[PDB]
Enzyme design. Structure first.
Site, PDB file in Angstrom:
ATOM      1  N   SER A 137      98.007  54.361  51.724  1.00 51.72           N
ATOM      2  CA  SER A 137      98.105  52.922  51.928  1.00 51.72           C
ATOM      3  C   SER A 137      99.352  52.310  51.295  1.00 51.72           C
ATOM      4  O   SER A 137      99.466  51.080  51.254  1.00 51.72           O
ATOM      5  CB  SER A 137      96.849  52.232  51.388  1.00 51.72           C
ATOM      6  OG  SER A 137      95.704  52.592  52.145  1.00 51.72           O
ATOM      7  N   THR A 159      98.130  49.797  46.184  1.00 51.87           N
ATOM      8  CA  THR A 159      97.533  51.098  45.921  1.00 51.87           C
ATOM      9  C   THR A 159      97.570  51.995  47.156  1.00 51.87           C
ATOM     10  O   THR A 159      97.942  51.583  48.255  1.00 51.87           O
ATOM     11  CB  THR A 159      96.084  50.945  45.445  1.00 51.87           C
ATOM     12  OG1 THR A 159      95.319  50.236  46.430  1.00 51.87           O
ATOM     13  CG2 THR A 159      96.022  50.198  44.124  1.00 51.87           C
ATOM     14  N   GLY A 160      97.189  53.252  46.946  1.00 47.95           N
ATOM     15  CA  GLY A 160      96.988  54.204  48.020  1.00 47.95           C
ATOM     16  C   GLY A 160      95.999  55.285  47.628  1.00 47.95           C
ATOM     17  O   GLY A 160      95.973  55.712  46.470  1.00 47.95           O
ATOM     18  N   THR A 161      95.163  55.720  48.569  1.00 49.36           N
ATOM     19  CA  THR A 161      94.187  56.772  48.315  1.00 49.36           C
ATOM     20  C   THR A 161      93.974  57.557  49.603  1.00 49.36           C
ATOM     21  O   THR A 161      94.045  57.001  50.704  1.00 49.36           O
ATOM     22  CB  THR A 161      92.850  56.212  47.802  1.00 49.36           C
ATOM     23  OG1 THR A 161      93.090  55.209  46.806  1.00 49.36           O
ATOM     24  CG2 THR A 161      92.002  57.316  47.197  1.00 49.36           C
ATOM     25  N   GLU A 191      96.217  54.745  60.829  1.00 48.02           N
ATOM     26  CA  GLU A 191      94.999  54.897  60.045  1.00 48.02           C
ATOM     27  C   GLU A 191      93.857  55.382  60.938  1.00 48.02           C
ATOM     28  O   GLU A 191      93.681  54.876  62.049  1.00 48.02           O
ATOM     29  CB  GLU A 191      94.615  53.577  59.378  1.00 48.02           C
ATOM     30  CG  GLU A 191      95.559  53.136  58.265  1.00 48.02           C
ATOM     31  CD  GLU A 191      95.148  53.668  56.903  1.00 48.02           C
ATOM     32  OE1 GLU A 191      95.690  53.187  55.884  1.00 48.02           O
ATOM     33  OE2 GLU A 191      94.280  54.565  56.850  1.00 48.02           O
ATOM     34  N   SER A 199      93.778  46.067  51.288  1.00 50.81           N
ATOM     35  CA  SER A 199      94.099  47.378  51.855  1.00 50.81           C
ATOM     36  C   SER A 199      93.392  47.607  53.190  1.00 50.81           C
ATOM     37  O   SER A 199      93.023  48.736  53.522  1.00 50.81           O
ATOM     38  CB  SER A 199      93.755  48.499  50.867  1.00 50.81           C
ATOM     39  OG  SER A 199      94.580  49.637  51.049  1.00 50.81           O
TER      40      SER A 199
END
EC number: 3.5.2.6
Length: 265
Positions: free
Chosen positions: A42, A209-211, A140, A100
């Site tokens: 993200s 953030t990113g995950t 995504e 997000s």
């Protein structure tokens, strides 16, 4: 010596750590695996809204976009609530950064047009800032599931930090649009336990953030010291040793940010 602590944190969590802080007038550049490729996840949702802002007038923010329940294909806390009403380009930018929202990200990619649903146009935007390394290839949620070693949908801490530097502290955007980007990143709700948790409370933090899978956990931020000196901090991690179902470890990103705050102090 700081490189011995980062490798110590890598031992503690079964992880691979990537850290880069651009150098300033008074501080040297911090680097740990800065030029090794990590997955975007993200992280791209912040330079993506800067791409839409760059190619469109502020009135473009009022265009309404309609979608169906068969466009919701990932974590989308906001888009799930407006499938009847629809969402404006302005609200899609707000939801894509502060929550997000995965569906808003894909719709903004369609707003950039071009082949591959906008992935070509987006990478073209990063090339325009000087980033000849990063690349986005999928949407995504497939962009979170590339196997380790694949270059698709990857960036590096070195590359994404310098791109973020132009967007928030540089002149990649005019002030009117620059104030919209910064305020959205400043009212983020998803990064309370990562970079923000490692810095003292009197340091101002904005982040995205990113995950993903294989224990991937990222956080990119711009921070301000108590006196007002700005820095750019990129921290990325994965745990490919544990396979596809490896759990991301937020505490690793928070602990690494404390080490950065000790040097900048």
């Amino acid at each position: 010596d700081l490189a011995d602590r980062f490798a110590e944190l890598e031992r503690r969590y079964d992880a691979r750590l990537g850290v880069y802080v651009p150098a300033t007038g008074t501080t040297a550049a911090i680097e740990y695996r800065a030029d090794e490729r990590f997955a975007f996840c993200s992280t791209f949702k912040a330079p993506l809204v800067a791409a839409v802002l760059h190619q469109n007038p502020l009135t473009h923010l009022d265009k309404l976009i309609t979608y169906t329940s068969d466009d919701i294909r990932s974590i989308s806390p906001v888009a799930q609530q407006h499938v009847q009403t629809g969402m404006t380009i302005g609200q899609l930018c707000d939801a894509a950064i502060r929550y997000s929202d995965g569906t808003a990200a894909n719709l903004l990619l369609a707003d950039l047009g071009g082949p591959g649903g906008g992935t070509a146009a987006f990478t073209g935007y990063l090339r325009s800032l000087g980033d000849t390394v990063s690349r986005l290839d999928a949407e995504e949620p497939e962009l979170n599931r590339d196997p380790p070693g694949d270059e698709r949908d990857t960036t590096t801490p070195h590359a994404i930090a310098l791109v973020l530097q132009q967007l928030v502290l540089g002149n990649a955007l005019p002030p009117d649009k620059r104030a919209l980007l910064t305020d959205w990143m400043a009212r983020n709700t998803t990064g309370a336990k990562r970079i923000r948790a490692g810095f003292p409370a009197d340091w101002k933090v904005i982040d995205k953030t990113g995950t993903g899978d294989y224990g991937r956990a990222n956080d990119i931020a711009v921070v301000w010291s108590p006196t007002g000196v700005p820095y750019v901090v990129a921290v990325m991690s994965d745990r490919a040793g544990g396979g596809y179902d490896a759990e991301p470890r937020e505490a690793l990103l928070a602990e690494a940010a404390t080490c950065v705050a000790g040097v900048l102090a």
